[model samples]
Target: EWVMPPIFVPENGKGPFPQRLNQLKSNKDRGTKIFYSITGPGADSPPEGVFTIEKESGWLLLHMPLDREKIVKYELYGHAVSENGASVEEPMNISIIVTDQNDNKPKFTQDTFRGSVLEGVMPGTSVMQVTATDEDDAVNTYNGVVAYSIHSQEPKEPHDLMFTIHKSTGTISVISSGLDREKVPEYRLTVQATDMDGEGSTTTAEAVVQILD
Candidate 1:
């Protein structure tokens, strides 16, 4: 006997509704009129109706699309019995893993981001990190790999580029040495976060960095 592991299904399926994963049946058909049923998280319980096993045909069916962020994996119990309600086989454990997709967009960690730094800061000075989070999975997929960048800068005192953000870590840093409190008391930078390695969904936020006199 071999060990069967969790089966995978895409969150946003490419096929039609009621997708058939496989059929569960007895080892051999003896004309005993077997009926199939599934129970547990995705079946007759919470997150219910996502999967249904045909009462007569034993075909495991997916009722609708899945979301990995909501429920990553589901463990269901499968059973088959004779027409008279006599158990023919013991309950078997079934694992269904929901695969990730680029459906969720990245979002900023806070509603508003504000940081303060002294005047005349050197280049590459660490100011603050404008973090972004995505609900999608980042382990086996790039759907949650947030890349941060500057979209726009307000009141370009000496230049249009005064701050820079690390693409991977979202750490905002001063890139110009012209930061002067008298010249520009406050500066606002429009920050953007992109999922899927900076090629997928993007979200925008404003970061206010004031120069301390």
Candidate 2:
């Protein structure tokens, strides 16, 4: 048996194996430069590729570069040999699991979205069609829906009178009566968008409207 470092790997098997690889036990917390090896007449072996360790979580991760197919099985094991191919206690096993991360940025369809609402309209009017495209899980949850908000004209603490969002299309219509883009010429406002079950880690895009003369 050989020792690898910075990753904590228990001895290949339990039941008081006659010999223990000391380096594997000692190199428990540093990053891994190599992998522990168990090669004997009955020793078991790891999977064919490099493996990484999540130090705090004690999770083993498969680190194969640019694998086209997702991994289906990561468990590997080896049985010790007694020179006569007899059993040497139980075998060592490793479990590998991969989890998802929020590493991608939520993105929009356009640099700026353009839409229009009539001069006087009721609530829920299709006030200028707007939509954003999220590249992540598009059908799972709120990540598919886009929200609308105005950045500049927050009325007050409770009365940030403005617009509402169409959960399906991302259209924004006035909720209060005071949107004169003519008097206010061009309203440069920030539109905040959030996703993933409203965790509030949001992204923003810009929208512009011009009141027709």
Candidate 3:
């Protein structure tokens, strides 16, 4: 078994380790091949983002950069190419270790949303809810909302467009005034959600309101 170099910098960063498959012991067997398996700290799938072992360079690297803010770890297991083109080695036991660095941005589900609310709904009435999810932990707030806005629906503006959202629940409600289904009929607006905590990383969503008689 061949040992590889560091692929990423966890603390005092300086790496890009390459997994040298060439290090694999030369076995004079027909149809011999090698495969890899990776595990993360606390024994997790795809431990630490994604581990990408360069097929060309034979170096193992992170398919995605590490997030320094969060601690991550990984391990690599190898197998021998067997006869009939299958991995074999009796028990097939061999492993390598990997670490992670923080460097990632939160992502959202959608950029535009199409929703509706009753035109004449009273204040505090429950309106359509808006939700955004993130892959990062809740504490990172990678996708947490700092602010939201509804883009003007052009001709529909100045018609007392007021709405509110519950911070933790993400439930939307009519905060002020009311809507008249007959007067406006329908509305088209754009909604935006932003995360100010992390350099104001923001994502926008849109929704259309159809007033019913």
Taking all chains together, each candidate's TM-score versus the true structure is: 0.88, 0.46, 0.49
- Candidate RMSDs in order: 2.2, 12.2, 9.3
Clash counts per candidate, in order, are 0, 7, 15
Ranking by lDDT: 1, 3, 2
Q: Cα deviation in Å at residue 113, candidate 1?
A: 0.9
Which lDDT tens digits does candidate 2 get at residues 4-56?
A: 23323321223332322221222322433323333321223343434543323
Evaluated at residue 126, the lDDT of candidate 1 is 87
Model 2 — TM-score against the truth?
0.46
Model 1 alpha-carbon drift over 4 Å, by segment? 2-5, 83-86
Q: What is the C-alpha lDDT profile of model 1 across 78-98, one tens digit per residue? A: 888887798888887789999
Query: Model 3, which residues run further than 4 Å from truth?
Result: 1-72, 75-108, 140-156, 196-199
Task: Give the Å shift of residue 83 in candidate 3.
Answer: 28
lDDT of each: 0.86, 0.45, 0.47
lDDT per residue as tens, model 3, 161-211: 566656544556666665666666666655555554434555656655565
